[PDB]
Design a protein around this ligand. Structure first.
Ligand SMILES: CS(=O)(=O)c1ccc([C@@H](C[C@H]2CCC(=O)C2)C(=O)Nc2cnccn2)cc1Cl
Ligand SMILES: OC[C@H]1O[C@H](O)[C@H](O)[C@@H](O)[C@@H]1O
Length: 446
């Protein structure tokens, strides 16, 4: 019965319409983000600011860098990456899966693991004896005192290792290295992944002064005028600021836009009440948002005969990669069918179409919300600079931006609508977070 199949779809659409954000909604978000950014930069309001605008101590500096071998560490997904880079060739690269116990255990365990992975890598390439300059991409909010010293403000993205928050991260790393005592490293720089991504792209294209990650988490950094970074002495040149925009909304700034699914995701997360804007966008949460929408549709007898399988009712079962796979479906529904069948469902073609619409609704909202953030930053920059038309390059990494079949296109379109009088070039970084840490280390070394 097509009429009834059709009636189901119309009811689904009414439910999914909740995810829509009009252009004026996005402008509001953008303005509110810019407001929060202003607040993070100012001494008077930094402590209260949800968007921390953390100085990175990465500065505009004359051309050039030290040459040779640099080790780069990259922590901030569940995979830890070690990279040898010769200044530039990524001579060698190894990725290591972080055990469950290390991400939610003690900082000692986490950093012991990291140190072990480093010895493994140094062994695979017979260079454990060589004392190397090391750049550390550490993808969490850090309050820096310098390029090589900064305290972890709080874990995000489900990290929970005790004894890390409030401590110098470079010290934690150094301590773990010393405890193992089988190699030595000169940790010269610690940067955020947004920062590393920007640096890696900047190397290729000097117009790159913004980095953005849309991966497990979502964040951005940009080159701010020193005169605007009240938290650091000096008015000359530029310094990269790590926005930590994922925490936008943590003070209520997004309340009118948060849906029931968002509340649910937030409440089941490792950091309830935190990173709310990130929870609208990041790959850690996207598949779960879809899962909750699907459960709602099942509850309304709109999907899967009103029955959800064990798998569909399993936390994290609807993987963000499935959202990407569903929206990649060519129209034969074959990809969608296979995902849902593996989730223990017996989907009809209508079921498949509805799941497609759910995915599109969540991912479009993610794209649009993300666009308001980036537009806020770029518009801010254009204003801070003398600029009628600002031509700028944004370096981007992260599986959501890179792998989702239509996120990038929706995101770009929306950003462009919100940034007239800007000309934004987007570059997808290759090795960005790893390569960027080595590059910053080479510059920090000179
Ligand atoms: C000429 S360069 O490509 O070697 C280069 C120089 C400058 C820098 C800066 C960071 C860039 C990023 C965007 C921007 O406008 C400046 C750098 O490495 N700065 C730095 C490094 N260490 C300590 C303090 N500052 C990086 C790089 Cl790869
Ligand atoms: O990994 C992308 C982002 O994830 C989270 O938002 C982290 O707090 C931030 O530091 C990082 O840049």
């Amino acid at each position: 019965n097509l009429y009834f199949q059709g009636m189901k779809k119309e009811k689904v659409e009414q439910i999914l319409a909740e995810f829509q954000l009009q252009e004026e909604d996005l402008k509001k978000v953008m303005r509110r983000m810019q407001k929060e950014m202003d607040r993070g930069l100012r001494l008077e309001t930094h402590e209260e600011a949800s968007v921390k605008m953390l100085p990175t101590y990465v500065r505009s500096t004359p051309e050039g860098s030290e040459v040779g071998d640099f080790l780069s560490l990259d922590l901030g997904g569940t995979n830890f990456r070690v990279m040898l880079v010769k200044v530039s060739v990524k001579t060698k690269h190894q990725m290591y899966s972080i055990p469950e116990d290390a991400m939610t255990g003690t900082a000692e365990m986490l950093f012991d693991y990291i140190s072990e992975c480093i010895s493994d890598f140094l062994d695979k390439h017979q260079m454990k004896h060589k004392k190397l300059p090391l750049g550390f991409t550490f993808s969490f909010p850090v309050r820096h005192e310098d390029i090589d010293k900064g305290i972890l403000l709080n874990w995000t993205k489900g990290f929970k290792a005790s004894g890390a928050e409030g401590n110098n991260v470079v010290g934690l790393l150094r301590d773990a290295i010393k405890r193992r005592g089988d190699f030595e490293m000169d940790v010269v720089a610690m940067v955020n992944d947004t920062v590393a991504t920007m640096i890696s792209c900047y190397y290729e294209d000097h117009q790159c002064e913004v980095g953005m990650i849309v991966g497990t988490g979502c964040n951005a950094c940009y080159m701010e005028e020193m005169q605007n970074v009240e938290l650091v002495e000096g008015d000359e040149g530029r310094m990269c600021v790590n926005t930590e925009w994922g925490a936008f909304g943590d003070s209520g700034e997004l309340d009118e836009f948060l849906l029931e699914y968002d509340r649910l995701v937030d409440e089941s997360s490792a950091n309830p009440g935190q990173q709310l804007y990130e929870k609208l966008i990041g790959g850690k949460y996207m598949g779960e948002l879809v899962r909750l929408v699907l459960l709602r549709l099942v509850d309304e007898n709109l999907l899967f005969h009103g029955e959800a399988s064990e798998q569909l009712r399993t936390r994290g079962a609807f993987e963000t990669r499935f959202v990407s796979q569903v929206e990649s479906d060519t129209g034969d529904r074959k990809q969608i069918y296979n995902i849902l069948s593996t989730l223990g469902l017996r989907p009809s073609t209508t079921d498949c179409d509805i799941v497609r619409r759910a995915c599109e609704s969540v991912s479009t909202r993610a794209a649009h919300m993300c666009s308001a953030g980036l537009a806020g930053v770029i518009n801010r920059m254009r204003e801070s600079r003398s600029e009628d038309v600002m031509r700028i390059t944004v370096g981007v990494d992260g599986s959501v931006y890179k792998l989702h079949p239509s996120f990038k296109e929706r995101f770009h379109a929306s950003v462009r609508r919100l940034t007239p009088s800007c000309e934004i070039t987007f570059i997808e970084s290759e090795e960005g977070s790893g390569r960027g840490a080595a590059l910053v280390s080479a510059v920090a070394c000179k």
